[PDB]
Each structure stands twice: as C-alpha cells, then as structure tokens.
C-alpha cells in the first residue's frame, strides 16, 4: 500500500 508514518518510532521494544 501507499507509505504511512513508521509506527515504531519513539516506542520501546521488549
């Protein structure tokens, strides 16, 4: 699909 904002920016991972 068309590009969208990267939703993982600013999030911590575990």
């Amino acid at each position, epitope marked *: 699909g*068309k590009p*969208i904002p*990267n939703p*993982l920016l600013g*999030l911590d991972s575990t």
Partner: nanobody
Amino acid sequence: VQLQASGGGFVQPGGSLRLSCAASGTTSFGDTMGWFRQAPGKEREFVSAISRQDDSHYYADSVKGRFTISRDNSKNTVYLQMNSLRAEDTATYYCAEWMNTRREFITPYWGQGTQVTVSS
C-alpha cells in the same frame, strides 16, 4: 495480499479476545507484522507489532500491559490477545506486514479486518 484477520466479535467490558493474523507462508512482505485498529469517525491507531531481529514486541501506550502479541511460526500466524477490553477498544482490527525501515515512513502491505465491539 492475503493477510486475513479473524477472531473478532461481540464482547462485554473486562472480557478478552484472541485475534489471529495468518500470513502467506509463500510470500513475505516481510520482517515486521503489526496490528492496527480503526473505529468509525476516528483516525487509524497503531496497536502492536512483532519484528524479527530476535523477536521484538512493540505496544502503543493505550494498550500496553493489556495486550500481548505473539507468533506461532509453525502456522505463519501472528496473534493479538486483548485483555480487560473497554468500550473505547471497539474498532475494526487489521494487520499489515512490512520491512522495518527505522525511518520516517514504512510501506505497509495490508490485510482485511475483523470487527471487535465491546458493549453491554
């Protein structure tokens, strides 16, 4: 893009649901799988993602601690368990697979949604 979400339905507040996101197994779009949700009249909201570099799990602040994302692998499926649901979690839930860019934008490859309605 065959990425069907299932597991939706009617649930009472406090209940749980386990959603399923069945990937191709033939084609990978492909290092990250995330769950998004969309409610009538609201903006699309990112929920959770699982990304392979070693399995990394991401959660939106609004579902952190209540939701769990996981993968079966043997069945090419990503699960989203949603616990202690509330009226504001009502929405269509759907998956996308993408390559984590670590940049401003991603290119999502979208699956079809399943409906979750939290009501009395």
